[PDB]
Design a protein around this ligand. Structure first.
Ligand SMILES: *[C@@H]1O[C@H](CO)[C@@H](O[C@@H]2O[C@H](CO)[C@@H](O[C@@H]3O[C@H](CO[C@H]4O[C@H](CO)[C@@H](O)[C@H](O)[C@@H]4O)[C@@H](O)[C@H](O[C@H]4O[C@H](CO)[C@@H](O)[C@H](O)[C@@H]4O)[C@@H]3O)[C@H](O)[C@H]2NC(C)=O)[C@H](O)[C@H]1NC(C)=O
Ligand SMILES: *[C@@H]1O[C@H](CO)[C@@H](O[C@@H]2O[C@H](CO)[C@@H](O[C@@H]3O[C@H](CO[C@H]4O[C@H](CO)[C@@H](O)[C@H](O)[C@@H]4O)[C@@H](O)[C@H](O[C@H]4O[C@H](CO)[C@@H](O)[C@H](O)[C@@H]4O)[C@@H]3O)[C@H](O)[C@H]2NC(C)=O)[C@H](O)[C@H]1NC(C)=O
Ligand SMILES: *[C@@H]1O[C@H](CO)[C@@H](O[C@@H]2O[C@H](CO)[C@@H](O[C@@H]3O[C@H](CO[C@H]4O[C@H](CO)[C@@H](O)[C@H](O)[C@@H]4O)[C@@H](O)[C@H](O[C@H]4O[C@H](CO)[C@@H](O)[C@H](O)[C@@H]4O)[C@@H]3O)[C@H](O)[C@H]2NC(C)=O)[C@H](O)[C@H]1NC(C)=O
Ligand SMILES: *[C@@H]1O[C@H](CO)[C@@H](O[C@@H]2O[C@H](CO)[C@@H](O)[C@H](O)[C@H]2NC(C)=O)[C@H](O)[C@H]1NC(C)=O
Ligand SMILES: *[C@@H]1O[C@H](CO)[C@@H](O[C@@H]2O[C@H](CO)[C@@H](O)[C@H](O)[C@H]2NC(C)=O)[C@H](O)[C@H]1NC(C)=O
Ligand SMILES: *[C@@H]1O[C@H](CO)[C@@H](O[C@@H]2O[C@H](CO)[C@@H](O)[C@H](O)[C@H]2NC(C)=O)[C@H](O)[C@H]1NC(C)=O
Ligand SMILES: *[C@@H]1O[C@H](CO)[C@@H](O[C@@H]2O[C@H](CO)[C@@H](O)[C@H](O)[C@H]2NC(C)=O)[C@H](O)[C@H]1NC(C)=O
Ligand SMILES: *[C@@H]1O[C@H](CO)[C@@H](O[C@@H]2O[C@H](CO)[C@@H](O)[C@H](O)[C@H]2NC(C)=O)[C@H](O)[C@H]1NC(C)=O
Ligand SMILES: *[C@@H]1O[C@H](CO)[C@@H](O[C@@H]2O[C@H](CO)[C@@H](O)[C@H](O)[C@H]2NC(C)=O)[C@H](O)[C@H]1NC(C)=O
Ligand SMILES: *[C@@H]1O[C@H](CO)[C@@H](O)[C@H](O)[C@H]1NC(C)=O
Ligand SMILES: *[C@@H]1O[C@H](CO)[C@@H](O)[C@H](O)[C@H]1NC(C)=O
Ligand SMILES: *[C@@H]1O[C@H](CO)[C@@H](O)[C@H](O)[C@H]1NC(C)=O
Ligand SMILES: *[C@@H]1O[C@H](CO)[C@@H](O)[C@H](O)[C@H]1NC(C)=O
Ligand SMILES: *[C@@H]1O[C@H](CO)[C@@H](O)[C@H](O)[C@H]1NC(C)=O
Ligand SMILES: *[C@@H]1O[C@H](CO)[C@@H](O)[C@H](O)[C@H]1NC(C)=O
Ligand SMILES: *[C@@H]1O[C@H](CO)[C@@H](O)[C@H](O)[C@H]1NC(C)=O
Ligand SMILES: *[C@@H]1O[C@H](CO)[C@@H](O)[C@H](O)[C@H]1NC(C)=O
Ligand SMILES: *[C@@H]1O[C@H](CO)[C@@H](O)[C@H](O)[C@H]1NC(C)=O
Lengths: 172, 318, 318, 172, 172, 318
């Protein structure tokens, strides 16, 4: 929510996306398509799984302790024991709350950061043949086929082949 | 057309999960996980710890040697389970500093009892009482000795016992509080008794208290129970001239993982590492809301009932 | 011109507030809020709790029945306030385990006393002493009974009292330590006394101690105060042959929110939920620096004196 | 302070701004103006108020406790009670410090993030008729009146009407 | 790691850099060069030193306490003392772990943010004479000497002197 | 060429350091710092605190006045160091509530003893015993007085001592438990003793216990040690008719930074502010893993052994 990609200039999510968490969707001169992006999906999944393994890892092992339930009324010692127990419980519940509160915020922020990173990388790939329309889509000013998009998806777009006709289409 | 279009986006689901953050208290994500275990199977499973079921016996009764507690001889445990239906059926007694002795015996984990040869000259041993029937006749505790007068006199008992071994020894002894002043001179001819138990670093002296008390199982007299710990190299001495409940030997003291717990859940044949009075609970989650009394590799007790951790992105449906 | 200009910016104020962050210790923001309450009104307000002002009486004095504490009969409270000018003006006494009894009575919240019919045959009741004047003549505590010899003899008192109700009972009794050996045989003809108070699960026996002590209000003798709790179904028995300060009935035991607190702040007619010895403080802030002794829905005590939370952006003036 | 907008390429704040927290200020062919932006202001205010309501919410309620002030000298039990009390106080003061330290950092960062989000949105609105001057201002290469700015303020700027003359003014 | 500069579109670090943490490296018409940037280096160093001084500052001072090692076996009081001690230790180790875990994440993120801030500032300086090549380098479309780069390094690049020839070199 | 190139980057090192973050457990940075101190020099340095080395004397032995503890008279300290080779070489004794007295004397920080003039009429003072040799002959503790019968009788001792000063006074007294019933009537003609020590707010009465005990240094009798605190304005009274170990004066009570610690590390001439039983450790790091027993401005004890804080950027080598 800090970078303004998810719930920002990206209006809403896609429910037809079942391969990965982030993907593309192109409208071409032959028909519509759809794909996924394994790189960002795996990055986000690895970070979230690392955090999960960090929190759920086991630490506690206690065998013999104090009495915590009493049946009669004695005095100073019993009052002190109940005080000790109650202090411990009240100090652990606060940690339990704060940890979850912090980690949810961080998880939301990192999942919002991956989307912006993917967008900025794609923008830097289409050097000066495309223009951003403000809602997440790019407008490309030359003619691609299904063999043009797959090159922007796996990092082999050669902008020096379409640069002149894009410059002629978008400035005149 | 002479152009194209390439849009980017993320995925969404029809129904998400509500989680809390630093700012917002209810935000919708695509997935979450639960972090607080809030249920138990109801059974106590017997692996990989050693569970001993104290069906009708408390720990002090099985220690002193109650007649109906005679199957808990030389037993060992990792967790003693005391039921709420337990009762005593022997001579009425009372232990000053009861919790100290209970927690001292429970944390040792053994009832192994070695018999030592004491020599009480001038008195009659093996006293009984119809309030502690052992079979068809009268009896007493199995680890204590009731010394009375021999014919017409009761001399001054003075005995000693050294510790040449390399472990601690636990001695349990007691004193007898009669009901009247005629019950005294008919068991111990001296009109007043006294018990002194001493080591090279400690001493305990008790004087009996004659008086009437409420009828419990048919008697108005009582027995007070004391204990002593003898460390290696030391030596125990006992001195008395009346009202002595003598020991017969010593229990052995150990150190490790052992405890006691009050619960009424039945016992089963699973594998589980954490035990609560409500039963055993799995410990794959970091927190817990079942009970604050635990034994083993358990989670931690918190006051909350649900704490969800987000494992996805924010859900923004179409 | 053939162009334009559009600039963006934020707002600023002439004087901000300094707050601490993870890196910097003094940064300027446009606004902040305070999180530690550091003052009190000085008064103790009497809503929505029930406050009882112990003007000159301590709790044990109002319990035993001191003559100048006779307005605290059958009273109830949610918080007992003990002043520092409180004194006692009756027979000199002392309570072994004083804190235990004070915290036991304070946390119950009642001084309701039911009178039971005891029968002490062979002794003279209602003893007095000029050190505890009740009006123009001599008297004693109002909830205790001083038994002395009747003419020329003092028999062995043996009494019983069952508990057929469904609540606990609290009995307060005592023993009398004389000054000399002639004051003994002139009040209780036996040259030594003894008190045994017993239930079906406990027993207490006391022996008096003759000796001289500092003069307090004109006497060198003393009184020791003990207590007993009888649970439903049980039965109390008392046995004695001298030096018995007998009870007259029983207090009722309850359970809930009740406590005691030492403070000298006056009492007012506000509405407040948190009470400290310095007075009542509002609890709208999460922390507090007034006192570590609190009662009610209070904030938490911290050592810091100010903790400011930023509620705006960074202030970068022109 | 992570995004570099406040105290970054924005030099200083405006003290003549009393409507909202973020706003505009235009220099036109008819005279100067000023306005505010309710969207970002309300977003930031809602987040900060949510955090405030999170921290100040009430949890503590205790009635009967242990003795914490003594008048004589007794021994083991009194020492243990004083130890328990001191441990509790020392463990709560640390939480009180850390909570405020973390929340101030997060608040500063989110108020810095809203400004960058507003700037980037405005940049995406003026698609290719404006150029950024590096100090927060935009330079527009056509002729607006007071009816042109109000359209960039409430999201109705139609860039296809001024695109040709802007392209002719900024490239030749 | 949130902004995608370090370990992102910047492949790897430079080991010939010993002056500062961030710097430049130009390839010109006369030969290669190298320099450093004191501004961002000092910013990052000041923040990290502030955080370090925050954590290592001294707070603890205790003189008389409870007994924590025993030689015999007594009962309730000793069990309660051992319980109190163990609870305190277990509650302080958790804080010690969480503090370091949070601060390392924040330090990595701020050192990644400084690099992106420097890059974006440099991009805003070369207004419309340069193009980003996607891997951290800028391509300038006019002819600089060693007196042209030093002006982009200390903030005196005047883009109105090279704008026409850059526009003629990069669009035709 | 007609163009140029300007690239930006960061710095890297050949070997970094592995640190933990919120997500990843092992990430490489260019530099880190250590936050847990895990070693000690082995020596105890003697600045800026005042260290007193109890070579062979425990605190109670140096208090009572043991013969080989006669250099610890009127001493002061900030930290008492008790070795493990310490032994006692005087009359065998025992202290009920030993830990209370040890922690009470240790936290005061003085052994300053003022001699008061008591008057015991009718008894013989300065009793000795061959188990506490002081030089070539028999002796006793240096701060206690052993009163025995004078010729053929032992009257009832009754003494008083007021406190007109403005500080507390600490009195140490005791009682003598004989071995047989013939050792009683040959030292105190009465067949039973009693000791009563009283103030205007308290009282303590002890009765001796005759019996045989293990031989320690050649005797079977013992001595029990009790204490009393007299506050300003009060007055102490002592009453007895046998078995009295009388005091000779009073210790002065103070309040401040003082404690006791068991350790066997030698003492050196450094400057250090934190002391552990393993030696003194520097306190420039916020945490510590040496010992949980500390004195002074120390770090805090944690269970971890290493905690590294990153002080650089992420290391991405070529
Ligand atoms: C000092 O004061 C105490 C208090 O009063 C006296 O003690 C009581 O002492 C009497 C003496 O015998 C006790 O009496 C016996 O009570 C038994 C209890 O049974 C109870 O329980 C049944 C149900 O289980 C009830 O129905 C019944 O009402 C009782 O509540 C009886 O079972 C006994 O009967 C047995 O023995 C006698 C022979 O001794 C036979 O004749 C009877 O038929 C019967 O078989 C007996 O009656 C009484 O229980 C004591 N009460 C308490 C509360 O302790 C002391 O005696 C007194 N001291 C002196 C020296 O006088
Ligand atoms: C064992 O040892 C103790 C210790 O000495 C003895 O006790 C003291 O006992 C005497 C016996 O009477 C006590 O004496 C009385 O003291 C009263 C205290 O007044 C004090 O306070 C006033 C101011 O309020 C001072 O001015 C005064 O000096 C005292 O400090 C006096 O008021 C009494 O006078 C009253 O009664 C007698 C008759 O008994 C009259 O003749 C007097 O005129 C006066 O009206 C009286 O003098 C003394 O207080 C005790 N001291 C302490 C510290 O307890 C025991 O007596 C002894 N036991 C045996 C068996 O011998
Ligand atoms: C009640 O019961 C107790 C327990 O038995 C009796 O006490 C024991 O009492 C005897 C009585 O003398 C004690 O005996 C003495 O033991 C000394 C201990 O030396 C021990 O240590 C050395 C090594 O240092 C060993 O070699 C030795 O075996 C012992 O273990 C001896 O040194 C004494 O010898 C000294 O004095 C006598 C004169 O009395 C000389 O004749 C000897 O030669 C020697 O010089 C002596 O033998 C014994 O130690 C006690 N044991 C314990 C465990 O306390 C009580 O006596 C009894 N009460 C009554 C009233 O009968
Ligand atoms: C990236 O995707 C493109 C899809 O266009 C792959 O290939 C083209 O590769 C096929 C394979 O023989 C050739 O026939 C086409 O002529 C290629 N077209 C272009 C425009 O290059 C390419 O191999 C993929 N690269 C990687 C690394 O996976
Ligand atoms: C686990 O067992 C405990 C012990 O009974 C349960 O505790 C009680 O809950 C009932 C009903 O809510 C109350 O009436 C009791 O007062 C509680 N006893 C306590 C708090 O000591 C507990 O509910 C059980 N937990 C589960 C999940 O079954
Ligand atoms: C609340 O009352 C307490 C009790 O008196 C005050 O505590 C003391 O402060 C004075 C002066 O600073 C010291 O001389 C005392 O030693 C303190 N007593 C303690 C700490 O128990 C406290 O200052 C009061 N608070 C306010 C805000 O008035
Ligand atoms: C956004 O602001 C503009 C201000 O220019 C509003 O309107 C123009 O609306 C008036 C209203 O009748 C018309 O007369 C003008 O011709 C409009 N000009 C242009 C350039 O469109 C507009 O209505 C506002 N929109 C919203 C949604 O508030
Ligand atoms: C920034 O660096 C430039 C390096 O080119 C400095 O100067 C030029 O300054 C020299 C100094 O006399 C002149 O001879 C050149 O003609 C200048 N060239 C240009 C293109 O301006 C400049 O002074 C530095 N500025 C600061 C503030 O340090
Ligand atoms: C500091 O001294 C303590 C006290 O001996 C050391 O503690 C022990 O470590 C040994 C060997 O690891 C164990 O056998 C003992 O049981 C430990 N005693 C305890 C935990 O009370 C400790 O190791 C020393 N620390 C250093 C750094 O030397
Ligand atoms: C909730 O989600 C499940 C699984 O995604 C789906 O089967 C179910 O229909 C959904 N129900 C609603 C009401 O959205
Ligand atoms: C949500 O996460 C859990 C594990 O955290 C996983 O088992 C489950 O499949 C996830 N939900 C979906 C819809 O994948
Ligand atoms: C208990 O153990 C002791 C010694 O280990 C042995 O002498 C005794 O016979 C055992 N008793 C039973 C019933 O096993
Ligand atoms: C401080 O701020 C208040 C309110 O904004 C203003 O009235 C006052 O003049 C300011 N004082 C100074 C010295 O800036
Ligand atoms: C600062 O915040 C408080 C509440 O947190 C508010 O009452 C006050 O008006 C604010 N200051 C200004 C100048 O608005
Ligand atoms: C106190 O209460 C009891 C019973 O509730 C009653 O018998 C008695 O008369 C009451 N006394 C006063 C003074 O109210
Ligand atoms: C480790 O770093 C040090 C200092 O940077 C260097 O001298 C040493 O050669 C390095 N060793 C390895 C194996 O990289
Ligand atoms: C790493 O940091 C420490 C202080 O935190 C410093 O002394 C050391 O020089 C640093 N390492 C390098 C290579 O500069
Ligand atoms: C100890 O101090 C007291 C009073 O301070 C003094 O009377 C006595 O002589 C001193 N003894 C020694 C050995 O210094």
């Amino acid at each position: 929510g800090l970078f303004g990609a998810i719930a920002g200039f990206i209006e809403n999510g896609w429910e037809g996306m079942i391969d990965g968490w982030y993907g593309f969707r192109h409208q071409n001169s032959e028909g519509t398509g759809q794909a996924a992006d394994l790189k960002s999906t795996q990055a986000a999944i690895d970070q979230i799984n690392g955090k999960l393994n960090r929190v759920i890892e086991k630490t506690n092992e206690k065998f013999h302790q104090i009495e915590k339930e009493f049946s009669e009324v004695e005095g100073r010692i019993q009052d002190l024991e109940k005080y000790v127990e109650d202090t411990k419980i009240d100090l652990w519940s606060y940690n339990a709350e704060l940890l979850v509160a912090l980690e949810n915020q961080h998880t939301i922020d990192l999942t919002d950061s991956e989307m912006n990173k993917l967008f900025e990388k794609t923008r830097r790939q289409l050097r000066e043949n495309a223009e951003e329309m403000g809602n997440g889509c790019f407008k490309i000013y030359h003619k691609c086929d299904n063999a043009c998009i797959e090159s922007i998806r796996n990092g082999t777009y050669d902008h020096d082949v379409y640069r002149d006709e894009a410059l002629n289409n978008r400035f005149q | 057309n002479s152009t194209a279009t390439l849009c980017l986006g993320h995925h969404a689901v029809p129904n998400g999960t509500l989680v809390k953050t630093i700012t917002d208290d209810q935000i919708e994500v695509t997935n979450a996980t639960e972090l607080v275990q809030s249920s138990s199977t109801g059974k106590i499973c017997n692996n990989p710890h050693r569970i001993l079921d104290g069906i009708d016996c408390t720990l002090i009764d099985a220690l002193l040697g109650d007649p109906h507690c005679d199957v808990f001889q030389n037993e060992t445990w990792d967790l003693f389970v005391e039921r709420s239906k337990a009762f005593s059926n022997c001579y009425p007694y009372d232990v000053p500093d009861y919790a100290s002795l209970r927690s001292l015996v429970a944390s040792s984990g053994t009832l192994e009892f070695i018999t030592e040869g004491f020599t009480w000259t001038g008195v009659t041993q093996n006293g009984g009482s119809n309030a502690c029937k052992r079979g068809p006749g009268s009896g007493f505790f199995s680890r204590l000795n009731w010394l009375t007068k021999s014919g017409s006199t009761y001399p001054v008992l003075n005995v000693t016992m050294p510790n040449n071994d390399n472990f601690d020894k636990l001695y349990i002894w007691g004193i007898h509080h009669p009901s009247t002043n005629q019950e005294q001179t008919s068991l111990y001819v001296q009109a007043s008794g006294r018990v002194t138990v001493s080591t090279r670093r400690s001493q305990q002296t008790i004087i009996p208290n004659i008086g009437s008390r409420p009828w419990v199982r048919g008697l108005s007299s009582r027995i007070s129970i004391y204990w002593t710990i003898v460390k290696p190299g030391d030596v125990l001495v006992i001195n008395s001239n009346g009202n002595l409940i003598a020991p017969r030997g010593y229990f052995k003291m150990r150190t490790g993982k052992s405890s006691i717990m009050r619960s009424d859940a039945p016992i089963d044949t699973c594998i589980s590492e954490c035990i609560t009075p409500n039963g055993s609970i799995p410990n794959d989650k970091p927190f817990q809301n079942v009970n604050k009394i635990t034994y083993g590799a358990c989670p931690k007790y918190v006051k909350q009932n649900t704490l969800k951790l987000a494992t996805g992105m924010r859900n923004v449906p179409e």
